[PDB]
């Protein structure tokens, strides 16, 4: 299962930030020069447009994953919910 999780990050790196150099990867390096940031763009609304060379959607997905992963542990403690739903 180690080659399973290692081939997750090497797919979620070389697609959406940032596909490096070292030829045998030279045209693979310019594949990130256009970037899949245009693919990553449409989730927010439009506003994080600065991802061109400081790439927001490359980084801000991991940090959005690490928040909802830590929302699970806190859920047991801060229950607060009545015999209903909220507004």
């Amino acid at each position: 299962a180690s080659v399973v999780p290692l081939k997750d990050r090497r797919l979620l790196e070389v697609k959406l930030g940032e596909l490096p150099s070292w030829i045998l990867m030279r045209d693979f390096t310019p594949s990130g020069i256009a970037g899949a940031f245009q693919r990553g763009y449409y989730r927010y609304y439009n506003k994080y447009v600065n991802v061109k060379k400081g790439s927001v959607a490359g980084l801000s997905m991991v940090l959005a994953a690490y928040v909802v992963f830590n929302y699970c542990r806190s859920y047991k403690e801060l229950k607060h919910e009545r015999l209903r739903k909220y507004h």
């Binding site: 940090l63 690490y66 928040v67 830590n70 929302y71 806190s74």
Partner: protein, 56 residues
Amino acid sequence: MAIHNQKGQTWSLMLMSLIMFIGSTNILGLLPHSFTPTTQLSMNLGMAIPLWSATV
């Protein structure tokens, strides 16, 4: 690097690893529900004493 200027410059390639760890693990925790390991007093008594007594 600039202050020391000795053959105690060998030690300084570690001290920039020490700045990135608690530079990051203090900056991650500002997020909504994250947890910082440098909150607990346990590891900081293991960051001081194996480094401080490495000097004397």
